[PDB]
Amino acid sequence: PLIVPYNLPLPGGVVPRMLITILGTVKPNANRIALDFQRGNDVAFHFNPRFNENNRRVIVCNTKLDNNWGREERQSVFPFESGKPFKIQVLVEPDHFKVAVNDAHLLQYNHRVKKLNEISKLGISGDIDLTSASYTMI
Ligand SMILES: OC[C@H]1O[C@@H](S[C@@H]2O[C@H](CO)[C@H](O)[C@H](O)[C@H]2O)[C@H](O)[C@@H](O)[C@H]1O
Ligand SMILES: [Cl-]
């Protein structure tokens, strides 16, 4: 049972065929989860479940460059549920991050940050009991 906020080092950044796995359970009455795939201060890929945005449940994806958020990409499909165990798999592909939750495809996020091998940390935060975070080359 890891401590959130949690930092996972990604040694040598990311690369296509890299599969990052995050296992956890959403706390009861949750408000947010965040994954932050960081190139130093920058956030190459921010993935942000919000359980109550104007009484809607939304996933917000974005990039942060020199302290500025870009154009959000919003996803209607919301596979998370308060109180339940989840698995998030982030596969790096040549042209995007591909995200599946609970073995079901969720979304893709085109790479805006190009220096993938400098995206050397994944921050995991929000209303979760974090069980495990690891990566594998597939
Ligand atoms: O873009 C991701 C970040 O979103 C903001 S919340 C964000 O704020 C702007 C105003 O600055 C607009 O209201 C947007 O509608 C709203 O989504 C969060 O504070 C960050 O943590 C990122 O999640
Ligand atoms: Cl870049």
Swiss-Prot record:
GO MF annotations, alphabetized: carbohydrate binding; chemoattractant activity; disaccharide binding; IgE binding; laminin binding; molecular condensate scaffold activity; protein phosphatase binding; protein phosphatase inhibitor activity
Per the database record, which ranges form the Galectin domain? 6-136
Question: One GO biological process from the UniProt record?
Answer: mRNA processing
Q: Where is this motif: Nuclear export signal?
A: 114-129
Keyword Cytoplasm appears in the UniProt entry:
yes
Does the record carry Phosphoprotein as a key word? yes
Q: Which UniProt keywords apply?
A: Acetylation, Cytoplasm, Differentiation, Disulfide bond, IgE-binding protein, Immunity, Innate immunity, Lectin, mRNA processing, mRNA splicing, Nucleus, Phosphoprotein, Repeat, Secreted, Spliceosome
Q: What is its main location?
A: cytoplasm
- Please tell me one Gene Ontology term that the record gives under cellular component: extracellular exosome
Quaternary arrangement and interactors, per the entry? Probably forms homo- or heterodimers. Interacts with DMBT1. Interacts with CD6 and ALCAM. Forms a complex with the ITGA3, ITGB1 and CSPG4. Interacts with LGALS3BP, LYPD3, ZFTRAF1 and UACA. Interacts with TRIM16; this interaction mediates autophagy of damage endomembranes. Interacts with cargo receptor TMED10; the interaction mediates the translocation from the cytoplasm into the ERGIC (endoplasmic reticulum-Golgi intermediate compartment) and thereby secretion.
**In UniProt terms, what function does this protein have?**
Galactose-specific lectin which binds IgE. May mediate with the alpha-3, beta-1 integrin the stimulation by CSPG4 of endothelial cells migration. Together with DMBT1, required for terminal differentiation of columnar epithelial cells during early embryogenesis. In the nucleus: acts as a pre-mRNA splicing factor. Involved in acute inflammatory responses including neutrophil activation and adhesion, chemoattraction of monocytes macrophages, opsonization of apoptotic neutrophils, and activation of mast cells.
Mind telling me what this protein is named? Galectin-3
- Species per Swiss-Prot/TrEMBL record: Homo sapiens (Human)
Point out the gene that encodes the protein.
Answer: LGALS3
Q: Which residues of the full protein are shown?
A: 113 to 250 of 250
